[PDB]
């Protein structure tokens, strides 16, 4: 009953163990080991910097 | 997998909303373009309050 009003919330998440992972794929899922995009991003056998 | 620029995910603000005491009406407008589908599997809402 004597709860403080103005009551400000905040979030947050832990994981453990675990790289974050970026796929380098069309639609980011598993369609194969040798992807789909790279056969034709690196296409006609050509260079990409990358930063 | 296309080479087409369009969205993998989709956000979708409702047209109509409506209050109530007791219930609360979202209408929504899902466009589907040419030369798409979507799966309702992958629908879901997204609901903010307090």
Known sequence: R?????????????????LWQIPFSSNFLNMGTLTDLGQN?????SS???? | TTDRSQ????????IQ??????????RFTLNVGDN???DLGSSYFD????
């Open chain 1, 48 to 51: 990409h910097s990358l930063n």
């Open chain 2, 17 to 26: 909303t409506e209050d109530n005491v007791n219930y609360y009406k979202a």
């Open chain 2, 36 to 38: 798409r589908l979507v």
């Open chain 1, 41 to 45: 991003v690196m296409y006609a056998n």
């Open chain 2, 47 to 50: 609901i903010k309050g307090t």
């Open chain 1, 2 to 18: 004597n709860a403080v009003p103005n009551q400000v919330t905040e979030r947050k998440f832990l994981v453990d163990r675990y």
């Open chain 2, 7 to 14: 969205k993998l995910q989709l956000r979708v603000v409702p």
